[model samples]
Target: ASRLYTLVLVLQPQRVLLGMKKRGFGAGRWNGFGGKVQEGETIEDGARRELQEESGLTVDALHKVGQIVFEFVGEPELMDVHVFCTDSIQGTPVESDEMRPCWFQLDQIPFKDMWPDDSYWFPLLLQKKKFHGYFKFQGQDTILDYTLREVDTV
Candidate 1:
């Protein structure tokens, strides 16, 4: 059961900030704020801590936006992702050791660098609609199958 913590942060619409460097296999060019889940921290705590540590902002509110399990055919580990969104926060985002904090347009975001599954659900989240989906990608290219549904309606 591998685990990951992610943060979906929103700032002033026109805020400008830094973007993270491309050091990993996925989402090598786009920008967001989040990281791996460290030991001794809950998913919720890790999400907030990583946000503050990378962006220098204290989240005032947060909610579990989504969760997905990615079974890479032969990857080193399975990926269990936990999503969170926070519009209420304090302080400014600052570049940190892992991520470079940045502000991207909610209307226009860089999708090229994000994970494959992101494209399917990110839009729903930005639309203020709760989304939940399950994606099983075979070797990162072949999508064996998937199922999606609106959380609120289901």
Candidate 2:
């Protein structure tokens, strides 16, 4: 099925709350705050809802900076991934059925425990840099990759 998804990067506690997948494909691991597209819901609205639902944060602004498509080899479905930047938000992040938001310092991220490819791009994102890339990997290993020329600021 075709769908829209969003990853919210809310800056509070000077930390980002990444969701821990609860099951299947990519479960028991960390990612950003996001979810499936809702009926009649805009991407920003979905993002805001997901952020609040997943992390208890009320977002005031969101920047749709970039996106990626998740196409597992031989899989019939294509998952769309939207990335957003939000430095202004309210409330604290909490655990839920689909996500368990955790805080890490901007300089200290547990990349080894995260998906193998995030280290390369997440840093650039943390630096307020704009990026476009794909983490072509199986499970947790990178097999192929590509990125655009970096942007200095988000």
Candidate 3:
């Protein structure tokens, strides 16, 4: 079985909001706001809640951008990551114990310090394209295999 997760990208005119994971898995890397989808909550609700908890921003609506499947060799739990984008939010972002929020301009996106997979698909996201991808990881900094493509719809 695949576990559900959501990653929300907060957008400004040309900048994108990302969070630095302060602890737990993926610590020390920048990423979109997200985490596990709760048992009873809808996936969208879980996405909203994760953004609020991680960045203190409340978004009313989120556009579903894409979906990605991540597989790590030897890890039992595979992840189905739902990627979302939202340009509107209710509160300014604030850092939490779990994450530190930051903004990066389109030209200054720190792909070197973020997940390797992000650099491949983030451009499509900026262009408002729907996409689907898969990544098979050996561990941090290395993708053993992958597949990515833009699609007309999700």
Candidate 4:
């Protein structure tokens, strides 16, 4: 079965909000704020909740920008991650126990410290195009193979 997840990227005129995972699954990396979707909750609701829980900020709506199927070499469960982005935001971003929120200047995004496939799609993301992709990983730090592309609908 594919496990569903939600990831939200808060964007601004010349910056983007990302979190440094302090613990758990994505610990030690800079990435979007999100996690598993709770049963019965819409993916968007889950995204909103995770963002608020991790960054102390909120958004009334988020645009669906992309989707990714993440596969690990030894993991049986495929992770279906839905990606959302919004330039408009609300509140200040405060750090949580799970993450340290930071705003990066657009040209200064630290992709080297993020998930491998991030560099591949972030351009499309920056371009405001919808996309979908599949990524195969050998482990946390190695992306064995992948495919990414732009689409009309996410």
Compose the digit string of candidate 1's lDDT tens values, residues 87-112.
Answer: 66688667666666667766666666
Model 3 pairs whose backbones collide = none
lDDT of 2 by residue, 81-153 (tens): 7789887767767777777777777776777767665767787677777766554444445546544446444
Q: Each prediction's Cα lDDT score?
A: 0.65, 0.70, 0.93, 0.92
Between prediction 1 and prediction 4, the one with superior lDDT is 4
Model 3 alpha-carbon drift over 4 Å, by segment: none
Structure candidate 4, residue pairs in collision: none
The segments of candidate 4 whose C-alpha lies over 4 angstroms from its true place after superposition are none
Q: TM-score, each model?
A: 0.77, 0.81, 0.97, 0.97
Per-residue lDDT over 71-153 for candidate 3, one digit per residue giving the tens place of the 0 to 100 score: 99999988999999999889889999889999999899989889999999999999999999999999877999999999878
Ranking by TM-score: 4, 3, 2, 1
Clashes of each: 2, 0, 0, 0
Best by TM-score: 4
Model 2 misplacement above 4 A: 139-142, 148-154
Candidate 4 per-residue lDDT, tens place, 28-135, comes to: 999999999999899999999999999988997799999999999999999999999998889999999999989999999999899888999999989899999999
Q: Assess the local accuracy of residue 76 in candidate 3 as a C-alpha lDDT between 0 and 100.
A: 92
Which model is ahead, 1 or 3, in terms of lDDT? 3
